[PDB]
């Protein structure tokens, strides 16, 4: 009873070791002539072959270091561990996969760093009202979520060069306001004012000193400042094992990359630290504004969360800007608002409300699959992300590591990380391909008959035109020596047609499309299924008539995708909660819903019906969101008891229903304010009389 390991693993130990991960190999020489020397493990034990001479490497993933997680973010803990395990040793035989797991928790009382980037251009002269107080007020907010807070700031205007800067009178220098007869301050690209410190007293006395400057053109190019505040660690004073918050404030739109060509600046941003002892950006005049891609890369590497705090006019712009820079949130800066207090807190809370996994330095042939357990053993497949999280919550991820063939590279280590956190899971990767008998393979071609061959551990093979047990046949005139294993049957023709066969091992190829390999030379290595016009969609390798998919691709035709990003609704929930994501496209299951993300559902239970369960589990501690323990998760809305009335307001919708107690409950919810969607429930529901 022949099998897969028998046919493809004939020639050598290496060709054997990679067929299927279940295949084993045999040393010996004892002499199993016929009854193939490869097979698998205990099945190779038909002939005894018990000693270590049998080669069966087992793929494994072992934890080198796993520290327990942390309840708090204080200092007396050995260190702060938000991710377990930490180090994992991964060993893989060709075409095999082992799956491991990782836990991620955002610990409470985690130290926070906040660096303010202020726009000092003349347009912001009106907006300087909100920069007063601050570090005192910054404490009165962040005190709830954090102790050992550290703040500081810096300022930007625009590139101090034409045609941004007023050069026209000599008095325009040192006094950008000459015309219109006032006093400004000489403009600057970026300058670091106060390094991160625990002193809010010094902070307030600094910001107060800050004054407005003036440039000519409306886009202010604050992106230069964002870059330098990131890539320069020592100047800003960012602390590792701390939450990094960069808050950005401005009056109008901004300079993007390639804008600097008008100023005669053709040199792209290198993303290095150009801030010197004079605390100014030196390359401001000599190099261009950074592209979104570059500042995305550097923000991610330094684990810094960018925050846009902008005026009501330009807020729509930077929101759309933020969509191109993941992990960044925007908020409204205005006198009528929750202003600067809530804004930073709400932003930091929104930033800590999500967990997604970064992957750094992943090898080519290596592939990763992610199942995500977020809410009480739910196990969401194909997802690296977790939505709607509080602080102190813990999530789990199961990861499958797949390798295609073997690189024969020595060692490479990659990293698995939660976005914007120092805590990391480092995976050391090794590949087992070469057998342990590689050593002492003998120095030369001898030990068979004369030479021209080699020696490896079971066979010694032979050279170009010998190829036998010992050297023999092969370019001789072959009598019908035997039919031996040239077909997997008697009446069956010669080996896979294809240049027939002679004296045991088959000569097959020439050929056409490239190599034809096998015992019977039955493996194509070219001929394969096609999706449209292309073999394996172009997304996979063809091995013996089978498609081995490239990373991020799956399926028989390799036309299926691992991407959930195109399945993400505007609300942030996968397929709008109304469907399942398969092959990068949502398949809607719901009472008549459609659309790409399943955002469109013209006929659906409206409003209150969905939020009825929310007020029932939250306020009344009652049915069907209580039972699955999804209440605290699925309802993120803010519910407040209102007194015996609801004032006629701006646009809003009233809702009503009967509870299990046969009482009439009335409630309303605001549509969009900050996007808060606050719930107002009327106290004293209407009940019958006795």
């Amino acid at each position: 009873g022949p099998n897969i390991c028998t046919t493809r693993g004939v020639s050598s130990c290496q060709q054997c070791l990679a067929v299927s991960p279940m295949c084993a190999w045999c040393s010996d020489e004892a002499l199993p002539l016929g009854s193939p020397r490869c097979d698998l493990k205990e099945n190779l034990l038909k002939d005894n072959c018990a000693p270590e001479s049998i080669e069966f490497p087992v793929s494994e993933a072992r934890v080198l270091e796993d520290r327990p997680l942390s309840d708090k973010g204080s200092g007396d803990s050995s260190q702060v561990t938000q991710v377990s395990p930490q180090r994992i040793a991964l060993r893989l035989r060709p075409d095999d996969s082992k799956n491991f797991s990782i836990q991620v928790r955002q610990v409470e009382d985690y130290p926070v760093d906040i660096y303010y980037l202020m726009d000092l251009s003349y347009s912001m002269k009106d907006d300087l009202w909100s920069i007063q107080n601050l570090g005192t007020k910054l404490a009165t907010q962040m005190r709830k979520l954090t102790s050992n807070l550290r703040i500081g700031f810096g300022a930007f205007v625009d590139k101090p060069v034409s045609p941004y800067m007023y050069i026209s009178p000599p008095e325009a220098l040192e006094n950008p306001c000459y015309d219109m007869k006032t006093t400004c301050l000489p403009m600057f690209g970026y300058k670091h004012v106060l390094t991160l410190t625990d002193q809010v007293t010094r902070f307030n006395e600094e910001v107060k000193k800050q004054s407005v400057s003036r440039n000519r053109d409306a886009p202010e190019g604050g992106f230069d400042a964002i870059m330098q505040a990131t890539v320069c660690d020592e100047k800003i004073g960012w602390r590792n094992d701390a939450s990094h918050l960069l808050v950005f404030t401005t009056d109008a739109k901004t300079h993007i990359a390639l804008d600097g060509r008008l100023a005669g600046i053709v040199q792209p941003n290198d993303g290095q630290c150009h801030v010197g002892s004079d605390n100014h950006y030196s390359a401001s005049t000599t190099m261009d504004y950074p592209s979104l891609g570059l500042m995305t890369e550097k923000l991610s590497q330094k684990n810094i969360n960018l925050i846009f705090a902008v005026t009501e006019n330009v807020v729509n712009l930077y929101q759309n800007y933020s969509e191109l820079i993941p992990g960044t949130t925007v908020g409204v800066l205005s006198m009528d608002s929750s202003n600067v207090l809530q804004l930073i807190v709400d932003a930091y809370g929104k930033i800590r409300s999500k967990v997604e996994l970064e992957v750094r330095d992943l090898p080519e042939e290596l592939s990763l699959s992610f199942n995500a357990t977020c809410l009480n053993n739910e196990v969401i497949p194909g997802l690296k992300s977790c939505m709607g999280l509080k602080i102190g919550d813990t999530v789990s991820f199961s990861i499958e590591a797949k390798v295609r063939g073997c690189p024969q590279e020595k060692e490479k280590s990659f990293t698995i990380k939660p976005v914007g956190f120092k805590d990391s899971l480092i995976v050391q990767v090794t590949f087992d391909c070469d057998c342990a008998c590689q050593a002492q393979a003998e120095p030369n071609s001898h030990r068979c008959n004369n030479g021209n061959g080699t020696f490896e551990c079971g066979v010694c093979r032979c050279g170009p035109g010998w190829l036998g047990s010992q050297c023999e046949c092969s370019e001789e005139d072959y009598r019908p020596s035997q039919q031996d294993e040239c077909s997997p049957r008697e009446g069956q023709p010669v080996c896979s047609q294809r240049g027939e066969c002679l004296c045991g091992q088959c000569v097959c190829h020439s050929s056409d499309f490239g190599k034809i390999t096998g015992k019977y030379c039955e493996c194509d290595d070219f001929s394969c299924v096609r999706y449209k016009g292309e073999m394996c969609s172009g997304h996979g390798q063809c091995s013996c008539g089978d498609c081995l998919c490239d990373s991020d691709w799956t399926g028989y035709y390799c036309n299926c995708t691992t991407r959930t990003d195109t399945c993400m609704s505007s609300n942030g929930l996968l397929c709008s909660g109304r469907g399942k994501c398969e092959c990068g496209s949502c398949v809607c299951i719901q009472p008549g819903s459609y659309g790409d993300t399943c955002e469109k559902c013209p006929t659906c239970p409206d409003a209150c019906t969905f939020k009825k369960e929310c007020v029932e589990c939250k306020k009344f501690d009652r049915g069907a969101l209580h039972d699955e323990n999804t209440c605290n998760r699925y309802c993120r809305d803010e519910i407040e008891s209102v007194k015996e009335l609801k004032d006629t307001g701006k646009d809003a919708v009233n809702c009503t229903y009967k509870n299990e107690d046969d009482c009439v409950v009335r409630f309303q919810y605001y549509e969009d304010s900050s996007g808060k969607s606050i719930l107002y429930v009327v106290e004293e529901p209407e009940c019958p009389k006795g």
Binding site: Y122, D126, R214, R216, E220
Partner: peptide
């Protein structure tokens, strides 16, 4: 209400 460049 009405202005352009950096000014207001």
């Amino acid at each position: 209400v009405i202005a352009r460049g950096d000014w207001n």
